[PDB]
């Protein structure tokens, strides 16, 4: 009970195999959630090269919604994972205690949860045994998705274990004995996430279990006058039984109700003794332009921040400018320099304040006199 | 239940162009990258063309690269391999399959071809 | 960008043959086996070319030593007697094997 620095406490639950326990780290009081995985119950092949491709696989899928993977620490008996932990508990806790959800958190949830699957998608993996007990909340009422490559091992392995065990959550696909559920189970378990979000009930619930496959088959369900008809579309579009009309994660970004209010973070691109290193520094700003366009291209600059100037030369450029708080002004001065013929370069120098204490600072307000400059310049 | 069953195919002058398609019944396309393979009597598998509708990118064989425009309908669940500018030696039965990228296991990425049409037979002759 | 290579042979029923793939490049655990009856659809036996598709038995199994890919049919049965194909897929382009055909000893 001990990996790492981390002492682990009273188990949570064993929801199918796997033995989840709080992990607590004794330095820095830091909860973790460590998930146990015997050998005997799931694992076939015992080479270290699987336990290699799954320290390469699991631990570079970061995503702000789904649970990250910190580590996998072998072990002769069992297999030891360290995600991490969210006091919040499972949706399906919350649906069982709130009841109905508004409808403007259910959306809040659903967009996060389908952005946590199209971020797998788009990483090449998919979760094919979703439910609202494998979606778990943090302290900030987020959707956090446990696992993704937890269920691809077991499914494979018994399809038809998990089917019985829960005819709802699995695909009817699945039950109707395909191969592969690829992501057509996604969307569809997303879509009764978003019915237990929407309605708190689960849509296909019987008691006797060849029945409640014949009710997996039957492309109807339940719906109550409590949810507007603009999100029933989409749940007739998204839990169908055959996958060439299910929903795709274009078909919902294009949808009405789901662009209501979406964060821009969820979608990445819509349309797409002291050793110290020495440095290179420079002189001013070196343009390779026409010296009668770059004092029209520092003019413009000097314009738009509002400064008083007045000049000597026609390279030599005395600005003022009055700060907002403080009640003096601040001078320095321009001068182009020519290093060759193609380049030229803009040094700034300034000049001391000779009799009035000013406040503030001289020197570090001539850097905010160039600061400014340096921007809008961009050269 | 999956079944590609082809069209389009059959008999083709020598720079005209065709358009031949795979209704694919049974699964969604959106996700899975149709694939094209072209099957020349007696020599072996080749392939030409490849569609994912999921990030929007394609790719070509060397061969065939920037002259069969592929196309892919989610709305219909069909592929279109508009072929254009054909030679004499493309002369095949073109077969249509899905291809699954995604991590089946967690040490195998696989990327295979699962489900194969009949293909239909596209012949050039002048 | 990348070439394949297999072998070709003939045995009997019930022997253990052996089908290399020596890819061009360096490659990953990405090819797959795909046996094609003469006037029919390609099925497919290996996807990993170390791990069974599920289906077709246990016969057929895959060991890859580096860039040699290789395809083992063990207790060879009078069913599996078609054409097998080498297929890259880890990079851009897929580059299939020149495909080897398995015959009857007589």
């Known amino acids: 009970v001990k990996i790492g620095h981390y002492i682990l406490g009273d188990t949570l639950g064993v929801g199918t195999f796997g033995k989840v326990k709080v992990g607590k780290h004794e330095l820095t009081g830091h909860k973790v959630a460590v998930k146990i995985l015997n050998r005997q119950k799931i694992r076939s092949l015992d080479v270290v090269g699987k336990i290699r491709r799954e320290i390469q696989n699991l631990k570079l899928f970061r995503h702000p919604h789904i649970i990250k993977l910190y580590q996998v620490i072998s072990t002769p008996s069992d297999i030891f994972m360290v995600m991490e932990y969210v006091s919040g508990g499972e949706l399906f806790d919350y649906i069982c205690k709130n009841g109905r959800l508004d409808e403007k958190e259910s959306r809040r949830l659903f967009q996060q949860i389908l952005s946590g699957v199209d971020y797998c998608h788009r990483h090449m993996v998919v979760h094919r045994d979703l439910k609202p007990e494998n979606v778990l909340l943090d302290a900030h009422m987020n959707a956090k998705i446990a696992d993704f490559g937890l269920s691809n091992m077991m499914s494979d392995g018994e399809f038809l274990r998990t089917s019985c065990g829960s005819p709802n959550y699995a695909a009817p696909e699945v039950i109707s004995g395909r191969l592969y559920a690829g992501p057509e189970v996604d969307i569809w378990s997303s879509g009764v996430i978003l019915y237990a979000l929407l309605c708190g009930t689960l849509p296909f619930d019987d008691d006797h279990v060849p029945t409640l496959f014949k009710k997996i088959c039957d492309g109807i369900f339940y719906t109550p006058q409590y949810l507007n008809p603009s999100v029933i579309s989409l749940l007739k579009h998204m839990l169908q039984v055959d996958p060439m009309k299910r929903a795709t994660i274009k078909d919902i970004r294009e949808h009405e109700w789901f662009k209501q209010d979406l964060p821009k973070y969820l979608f990445p691109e819509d349309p797409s003794h002291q050793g110290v290193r020495k440095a290179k520094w420079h002189l001013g700003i070196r343009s390779q332009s026409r010296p009668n366009d770059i004092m029209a291209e520092v003019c413009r600059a000097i314009k738009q921040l509002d400064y008083e100037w007045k000049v000597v030369n026609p390279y030599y450029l005395r600005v003022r400018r009055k700060n907002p708080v403080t009640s003096t002004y601040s001078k320095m001065s321009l001068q182009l320099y020519q290093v060759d013929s193609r380049t030229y370069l803009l040094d700034f120098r300034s000049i001391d304040d000779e009799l009035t204490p000013r406040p503030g600072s001289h020197t570090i307000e001539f850097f905010e006199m160039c600061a400014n400059l340096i921007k809008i310049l961009a050269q | 239940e999956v079944q590609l069953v082809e069209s389009g195919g059959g008999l083709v002058q020598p720079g005209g162009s065709l358009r031949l398609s795979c209704a694919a019944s049974?699964?969604?396309?959106?996700?899975?990258?149709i694939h094209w393979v072209r099957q020349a009597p007696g020599k072996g598998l080749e392939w030409v063309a490849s569609?994912?509708?999921?990030?929007?990118?394609?790719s070509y064989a060397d061969s065939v690269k920037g002259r069969f425009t592929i196309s892919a309908d989610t709305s219909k669940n069909t592929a279109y391999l508009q072929m254009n500018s054909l030679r004499a030696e493309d002369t095949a039965v073109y077969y249509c399959?899905?291809?699954?990228?995604?991590?089946?296991?967690?040490?195998?990425?696989?990327?295979?071809?699962?489900?194969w049409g009949q293909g239909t037979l596209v012949t050039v002759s002048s | 960008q990348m070439t394949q290579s297999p072998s070709s042979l003939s045995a009997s029923v019930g022997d253990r043959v052996t089908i290399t793939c020596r890819a061009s490049?360096?490659?990953?655990?990405?090819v797959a086996w795909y046996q094609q009856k003469p006037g029919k659809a390609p099925k497919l036996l290996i996807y990993?070319?170390?791990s069974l598709y599920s289906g077709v038995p246990s016969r057929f199994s895959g060991s890859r030593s580096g860039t040699d890919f290789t395809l083992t049919i063990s207790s060879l049965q009078p069913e599996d007697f078609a054409t097998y194909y080498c297929?890259?897929?880890?990079?851009?382009?897929?580059?299939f094997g020149q495909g080897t055909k398995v015959e009857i000893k007589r």
């Open positions: 399959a899905r291809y699954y990228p995604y991590f089946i296991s967690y040490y195998s990425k696989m990327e295979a071809m699962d489900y």
């Open positions: 049974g699964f969604n396309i959106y996700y899975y990258s």
């Open positions: 569609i994912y509708p999921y990030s929007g990118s394609t």
């Open positions: 490049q360096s490659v990953s655990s990405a």
């Open positions: 990993s070319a170390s």
């Open positions: 297929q890259q897929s880890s990079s851009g382009p897929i580059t």
